[PDB]
Amino acid sequence: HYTCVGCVLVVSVIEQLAQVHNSTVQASMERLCSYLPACYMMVHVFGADIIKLFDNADVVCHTLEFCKQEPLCHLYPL
Amino acid sequence: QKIKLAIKNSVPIKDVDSDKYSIFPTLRGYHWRGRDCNDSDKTVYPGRRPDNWDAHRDSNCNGIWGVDPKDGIPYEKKFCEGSQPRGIILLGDAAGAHFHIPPEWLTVSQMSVNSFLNLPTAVTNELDWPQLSGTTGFLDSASKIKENSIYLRLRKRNRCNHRDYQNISKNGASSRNVKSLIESLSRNQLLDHPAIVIYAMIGNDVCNGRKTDPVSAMTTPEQLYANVLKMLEALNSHLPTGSHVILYGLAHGAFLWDTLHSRYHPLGQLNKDVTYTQLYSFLGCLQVSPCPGWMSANETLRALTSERAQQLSETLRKIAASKKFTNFNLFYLDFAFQEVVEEWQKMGGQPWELIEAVDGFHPNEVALLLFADQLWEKVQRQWPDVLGKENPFNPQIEEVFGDQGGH
Numbered sequence: 001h002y003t004c005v006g007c008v009l010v011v012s013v014i015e016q017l018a019q020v021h022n023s024t025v026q027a028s029m030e031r032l033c034s035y036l037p038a039c040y041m042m043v044h045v046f047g048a049d050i051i052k053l054f055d056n057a058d059v060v061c062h063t064l065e066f067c068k069q070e071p072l073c074h075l076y077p078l
Numbered sequence: 079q080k081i082k083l084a085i086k087n088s089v090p091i092k093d094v095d096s097d098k099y100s101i102f103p104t105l106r107g108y109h110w111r112g113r114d115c116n117d118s119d120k121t122v123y124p125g126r127r128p129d130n131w132d133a134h135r136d137s138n139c140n141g142i143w144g145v146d147p148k149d150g151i152p153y154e155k156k157f158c159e160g161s162q163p164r165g166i167i168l169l170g171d172a173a174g175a176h177f178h179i180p181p182e183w184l185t186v187s188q189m190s191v192n193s194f195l196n197l198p199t200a201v202t203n204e205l206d207w208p209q210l211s212g213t214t215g216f217l218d219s220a221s222k223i224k225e226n227s228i229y230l231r232l233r234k235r236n237r238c239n240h241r242d243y244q245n246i247s248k249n250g251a252s253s254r255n256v257k258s259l260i261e262s263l264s265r266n267q268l269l270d271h272p273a274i275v276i277y278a279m280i281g282n283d284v285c286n287g288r289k290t291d292p293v294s295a296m297t298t299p300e301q302l303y304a305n306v307l308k309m310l311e312a313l314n315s316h317l318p319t320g321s322h323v324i325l326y327g328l329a330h331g332a333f334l335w336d337t338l339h340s341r342y343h344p345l346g347q348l349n350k351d352v353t354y355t356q357l358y359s360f361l362g363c364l365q366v367s368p369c370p371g372w373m374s375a376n377e378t379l380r381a382l383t384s385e386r387a388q389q390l391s392e393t394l395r396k397i398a399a400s401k402k403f404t405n406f407n408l409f410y411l412d413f414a415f416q417e418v419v420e421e422w423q424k425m426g427g428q429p430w431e432l433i434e435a436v437d438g439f440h441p442n443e444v445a446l447l448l449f450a451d452q453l454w455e456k457v458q459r460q461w462p463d464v465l466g467k468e469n470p471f472n473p474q475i476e477e478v479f480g481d482q483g484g485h
């Protein structure tokens with residue numbers, strides 16, 4: 001439900017942060033954590049093994065199991 | 079824990095004397111209703127008639143109390159005896175509560191540290207911003223707009239009404255669930271001043287049916303008629319005599335698709351790869367659309383949605399014409415959408431600037447204050463008693479009591 005919307009939204013600012021800061025997903029994911037007044041227990045760590053290496057938000061959230069598919073819901077053109 | 083109860087009943091969590099007024103801003107606190115000047119006394123709260131004219135203490139929290147040393151008259155008697163104070167109460171939905179996701183959050187362009195400074199407040203207010211809303215806002219609009227909320231216009235008009243606002247709005251509110259919101263309304267029929275109540279459910283009656291046939295999910299004129307009647311009977315047993323109730327019609331949401339269907343959502347302004355059509359389709363696919371009827375690309379479905387909405391407005395208009403109540407008189411106002419657009423063009427704005435950027439559905443702060451502006455001017459000409467008289471003692475109250483304790 002909203003986890004797909006939220007994931008797509010969260011993942012879309014991360015990916016739009018690396019594109020803006022010419023960095024990797026690991027760099028943006030860590031940078032995002034600096035903006036919220038201490039998620040690094042997950043992202044610097046839990047997201048490292050899961051995140052950077054595989055590479056849009058619809059794919060990731062579909063890949064990360066956040067947008068279950070049983071119509072294929074997508075925000076960006078496929 | 080009973081925290082759950084306070085949010086399900088839309089009453090503050092921080093409220094020791096349980097009079098529904100808080101010293102805490104968020105969590106249904108004083109961002110939503112006047113601040114409790116004594117959260118240890120259930121008989122001290124905004125909107126109350128003064129006990130012995132507040133000669134010894136401020137019991138209605140309007141900042142006026144004590145006695146004039148010259149004649150031993152209580153100040154609130156010299157400055158409020160005949161001014162006919164009244165409260166403002168909004169029974170509304172997400173728009174009345176001013177639902178707002180700041181564009182600054184989803185825009186990587188400016189994601190500065192100052193951009194997320196307001197997040198824990200927004201979340202504790204259910205992403206609503208009543209303290210900036212058009213009916214009950216009291217904080218200065220930092221948005222380059224010098225219109226004032228309805229409450230601030232009532233305060234400016236009569237400084238005795240200071241802090242007598244209540245925003246009884248819930249994101250998903252409609253005629254179908256307004257009975258819960260009225261339980262959370264605060265007013266003692268014999269001990270408090272009268273109030274203006276604005277009933278403003280401007281779309282949820284036609285904006286459900288996320289997982290069904292949208293038209294089949296909408297409220298029927300019969301359903302809404304019975305719901306609103308029961309609603310008004312309840313108000314009649316809570317509102318002091320001499321109150322006023324305004325029924326607001328439903329929105330002309332066809333405006334949404336027409337204005338935005340091919341405009342860039344803030345999450346697509348940089349890469350130019352997202353429109354509201356896409357957003358509408360994405361959320362519809364997930365069955366999480368805030369309004370399937372109007373946020374569709376299917377212009378027949380949008381036409382059926384507007385038709386039902388208009389049919390429900392005429393139902394509310396019929397009620398305001400044919401039903402009378404002992405403790406309030408009853409009025410009907412159309413959704414002034416057209417008049418808001420004319421007035422906004424004159425100020426150099428375009429229509430799409432009147433809609434929340436993130437959700438592309440609710441009117442934004444600018445539109446709400448314009449809706450308040452139109453309601454205030456229209457009520458004056460036609461129904462002057464509803465707003466009362468100007469109080470000649472505003473400067474003197476101002477000089478004796480300053481900010482009257484603030485907000």
Ligand SMILES: *[C@@H]1O[C@H](CO)[C@@H](O[C@@H]2O[C@H](CO)[C@@H](O)[C@H](O)[C@H]2NC(C)=O)[C@H](O)[C@H]1NC(C)=O
Pocket residue numbers: 115116117118119
């Ligand atoms: C709220 O009102 C109460 C009284 O109704 C105030 O508390 C008492 O005030 C008396 C004097 O009026 C004291 O003798 C008591 O010790 C106070 N406490 C209690 C528990 O009665 C209280 O001060 C008021 N609050 C504010 C902010 O003015």
Ligand SMILES: *[C@@H]1O[C@H](CO)[C@@H](O)[C@H](O)[C@H]1NC(C)=O
Pocket residue numbers: 292293376378379382
């Ligand atoms: C438009 O919506 C209605 C639902 O009221 C549906 O019956 C109709 O088939 C839809 N048409 C298209 C082309 O999607």
Ligand SMILES: [Ca+2]
Pocket residue numbers: 095097099114115116117118119120121122123
């Ligand atoms: Ca109190």
Ligand SMILES: [Ca+2]
Pocket residue numbers: 093094095096097098099100114116117118
């Ligand atoms: Ca209280």
Ligand SMILES: [Ca+2]
Pocket residue numbers: 128132135136137138139140141142143154
């Ligand atoms: Ca007082």
